[PDB]
Subunit: 245 residues, 2 copies
């Protein structure tokens, strides 16, 4: 039976677009651009560092990705500036119905499995006021890999003591849904962007920057095994788990 | 001493934009979009499949990436349609100066190290009439990983009997430059997009779709070791090798 609900962090429980106000500062007029590329490169760098066998924690990844992004704009900020701005990733606003969701899931074990480095995750959850909502906040850092590497998902059993079959994994990220499924978890994908809306947006005339990234990041990935469930919001999870098993 | 010049294929020797006509037929008015997302997802899927430890050859990856891309537009092509259109990747036009470059590089050992499946590569190289320009056309397939996994680069010594130190690796792809450097090759990066032009393009007002992808794919990656050399075109490599030795 489902004994634990384990959540992806960035993009699932926390809004990675909420760095917008801060990025709009590093380049007025380019906040949206920066937000999108920063996130895209954060992901790419986590995958590429892991696949090369050259791990560095998510804090290093986040700053390298920011440096790349600002560099495309012709900037060359120093490490101090990068470290200060990157703190935006430790203050992402949780999704509105995150709190209520975790609450209604109080009976079950509740955890996070994230690429985020140990200190990033504590700040992020604390700042979101959700520290008391998790029995464990698990960082991939100990394994020195990034999702979707199987060793990342292995941590759930190592920490919670439950087997893959007894875990409901939750993510808004297609590649993470894929990695969780490959590992053996049941998965609930959070799909906040309706496929039909994206399709029409993509033909609504000239394709805007933001549309490109939605197109790259907010769909199920074709190589991946389908999630067991798809809900439009975290709030639908408790009711999903009720009439589930 | 440099005894062999090993080339990345897609994006380096061959123009991944040359699928322009096939994609425009697939969805008139959206050929540019499809071209860009197809290539982006092709890369992502190669990385993610490898990192999950769920390898499929580049032919499956290419078809899956295409299926994803067309799906964003609201289409649902059958496998027959996908296999047919994906053929476009086995017809990529080589860059105008590749032939000359390869010619002037003899009698140095010359090879390709590519994600492409064996059949994709031989059909691609044959169609461009470059079969006799290479001592070896190496697919990563034997190792069942994708670049930048170190095993893919390990194939070079296995096939050519030259050590990493005796190899000049050539690539226009930042992640591949990074992988080859991590492994131990000397690397010449082919940089077709001037940083200063990109920076100004990204400030020129509304950011056209195509600018996004250049922004994502045509720079050195911040996590990667810097290439030993950077040239504007493949035609410059023979000159580079001389002034080098």
């Amino acid at each position: 039976m489902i004994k634990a609900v384990v959540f992806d962090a960035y993009g699932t429980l926390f809004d990675v677009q909420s760095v917008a106000d801060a990025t709009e500062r590093a380049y007025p007029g380019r906040g949206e651009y920066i937000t999108q590329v920063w996130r895209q490169k954060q992901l790419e760098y986590s995958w590429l560092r892991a696949l090369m066998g050259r791990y560095a924690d998510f804090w290093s990844v986040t700053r390298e990705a920011l440096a790349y992004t600002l560099g495309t704009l012709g900037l060359e900020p120093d490490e101090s500036f990068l470290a200060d701005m990157a703190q935006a990733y430790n203050r992402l606003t949780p999704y509105p119905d995150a709190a209520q969701c975790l609450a209604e899931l109080a009976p079950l074990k509740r955890a996070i499995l994230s690429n985020g480095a140990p200190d990033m995750l504590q700040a992020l959850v604390a700042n979101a006021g959700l520290t008391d909502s998790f029995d464990a906040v698990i960082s991939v850092d100990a394994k020195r890999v990034f999702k979707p590497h199987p060793d990342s998902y292995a941590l759930v059993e190592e920490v919670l003591g439950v087997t893959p079959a007894e875990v409901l994994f939750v993510s808004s990220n297609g590649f993470d849904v894929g990695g969780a499924k490959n590992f053996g978890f049941s998965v609930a994908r959070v799909a906040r962007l309706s496929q039909e809306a994206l399709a029409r947006e993509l033909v609504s005339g000239t394709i805007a920057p933001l549309t490109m990234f939605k197109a790259l990041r907010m769909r199920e990935e074709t190589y991946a095994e389908a999630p067991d469930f798809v809900v439009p919001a975290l709030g639908d999870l408790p009711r999903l788990v009720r009439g589930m098993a």
